[PDB]
Design a binder for this molecule. Sequence first.
Ligand SMILES: O=C(COc1ccc(Cl)cc1)N[C@H]1CC[C@H](NC(=O)COc2ccc(Cl)cc2)CC1
Lengths: 307, 280, 280
Amino acid sequence: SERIESFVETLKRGGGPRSSEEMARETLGLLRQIITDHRWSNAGELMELIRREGRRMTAAQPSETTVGNMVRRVLKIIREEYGRLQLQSNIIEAINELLVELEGTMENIAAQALEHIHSNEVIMTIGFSRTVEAFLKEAARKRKFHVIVAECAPFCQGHEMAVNLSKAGIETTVMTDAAIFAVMSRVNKVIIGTKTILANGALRAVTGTHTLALAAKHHSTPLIVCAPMFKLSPQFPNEEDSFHKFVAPEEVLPFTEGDILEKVSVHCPVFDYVPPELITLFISNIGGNAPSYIYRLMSELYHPDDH
Amino acid sequence: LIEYFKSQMKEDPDMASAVAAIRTLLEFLKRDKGETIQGLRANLTSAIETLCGSSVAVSSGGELFLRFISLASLEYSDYSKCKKIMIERGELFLRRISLSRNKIADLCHTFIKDGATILTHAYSRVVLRVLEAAVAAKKRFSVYVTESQPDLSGKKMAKALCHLNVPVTVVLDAAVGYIMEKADLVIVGAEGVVENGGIINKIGTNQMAVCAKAQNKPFYVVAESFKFVRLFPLNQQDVPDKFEHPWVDYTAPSLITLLFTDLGVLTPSAVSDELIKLYL
Amino acid sequence: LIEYFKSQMKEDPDMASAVAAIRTLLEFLKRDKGETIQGLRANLTSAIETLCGSSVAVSSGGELFLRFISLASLEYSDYSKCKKIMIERGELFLRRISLSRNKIADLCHTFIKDGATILTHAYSRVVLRVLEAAVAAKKRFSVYVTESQPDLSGKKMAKALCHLNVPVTVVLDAAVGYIMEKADLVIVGAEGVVENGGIINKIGTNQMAVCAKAQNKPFYVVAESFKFVRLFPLNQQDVPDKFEHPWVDYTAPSLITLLFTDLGVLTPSAVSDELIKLYL
Ligand SMILES: O=C(COc1ccc(Cl)cc1)N[C@H]1CC[C@H](NC(=O)COc2ccc(Cl)cc2)CC1
């Protein structure tokens, strides 16, 4: 039915499912359903329906790149499926296989953790991500390091993670965002989680990632950005200023203190821009690929209908 | 054949001479005897005979269509081999090379920054194609150029660009430093690209690009699908015999940012995958 | 006075353009009325009237001898003040400025590296004085030059240097990149030096020196005791009105290595001590 319209409203109003397999499980859901019973013509009228419902879905808040990402990957499975080509059986089966493969990202991307962090090694991360916390929790069967976590990004959603870590693990300290250059003279091995990563090799992340990565390639310490698959976005950074989320400036200035709020301009960006000239490894779901290789990995997944 | 190729490029305001040489060796590859293997070696001698003249791209097309024709040894036949299928396959390949610049422009157009001051040190064809489409659908931008001293060829871009009706200034080639404080998005085309993603163009390019990644502005390059050679230098004064008389210089791939090609948009460390995908 | 100064520098194959103005204001400071304080302000108007013409060093000498004459207000007198003692004191300040270059050479000579390839982008007087003494007592060295496009004045150094009988090549000013792989110990003279130890010279200097501290070769500068101004820029396009028409450029003191002066050898962060020792 048209419950997708509710879904089309659901992404419209906001209220995030954490990006933790809700966006992907849902997009796989609706694509499974529209794939299941709809109009049928042989010559990619299903694919045309995928383009229509696709561009209608991408008409949501243009930041949830996972939605269009798994949309496009469904299209590539359609193209290879016809390439080898009862097609609905093969297509829905292979989509089921992609679902089951998607069902294990946060474990296998967290197995490869003992081979990086060593004893007595002051790691450092900004913001909070499910994968970086799960990833760092499987390195609690090794020695006691520190963790320095920045309290950035008002609204500063940083701490919950310092709770969820400290009461289970290593001695974490919490620094304000405005002290990331007295620290980072006494550190090594920075990690950051990624909101989405671009074709050229860029990280679009939380609103303090830049000014931090600059410190990494100033003191020459390597920064990993642990990020799973399905978040390799095409469309190299051409579209400008729709690259973000501008939120209400109530979060940065209070509605109190009248009259000053007549003539003064408040800005609030949610994301930022990390260029590929500063990232020094990607830990990923299948391999461990470098920055400058990321290009062909994208060509491994998609097809030139990247629009 | 020399008068034939010179005749082909004489009546041509576009379709670059490296390209003209391709059609020249196409027709002079058609009307010759010896439908056999070693007869192609005679064309190899013609590949030297065409290479008489400079202009590295000519040798690039030489090995290019030399490999394109040379791939017909596989799918083996006798006296009527599928290089004759690469007469129209090739014609298709020549029209494939002919329609190349349009895709480079349609990809490239978007990166202009709507209030940008594009700098260029050349007189390039495809730069003017893409930049002409850029004004022909989109915002405004200034352009600064400097003139290459042993051609003054930048002024040709000054004239033809003034026919494109956009505000141009052009300062001399000694004071590029003074230019770059007031500039962004440096764009240049290129004669050839070596196997690690480095450019060779006119004899002033590195004198800028060394100054490009000091004031942190980007530096793009753009070329068609014929500048990929197997050559590999490692220093200046290690270029081949292709030059007060130098003609081309070298820019290391630790400076060239995202480049453009007929295969699509590209990063400066994926060219090796293309050429190693081809040559072996 | 204009014909007097132009007359002074017309019959002069050496001497400073600045030194010519210094003697001009010396004699035209001698033969004038108003032996008083405010009469000096008339000379200040003459300081503007001399400053009619460019060439920043002229204003430098203007404030220089303006302060040298101006220091005679201390040790106070009336109508026969010790600026008249700075007629011969000054005269010997003018011979003090005249014998300046010889000390700069006698200090400077040693840094030539006996098999060196000295690069220079100019036509300087004192560079040729020191380099002439350098061959005139010591080892051998090549020299590379490039020609400044709106004077071609480098070729004057090519000619006069060939009269000094050392092997010179001279390439054009676009391919300095191609030069620096085969070069060491870049030497340039300078018109003016700003208060943080930065140089202003011809309109190509930064286009090199940005490339000097990338291939890690040093970069010296050398000037007499008359280029110290109180001026202080902080960016390009923030130079004063002293300029396809720029004439001078700027090189930040994070690039200039050990420089030479009539006070002695000097580091690029001790100039401020000299001028602040003087001006207050
Ligand atoms: O314990 C801390 C905590 O310091 C901070 C934590 C957080 C912040 Cl914001 C600031 C400081 N720092 C270091 C102290 C040395 C130790 N390492 C060693 O004791 C080992 O020393 C070595 C390691 C390798 C070699 Cl080759 C030689 C000595 C790592 C942790």
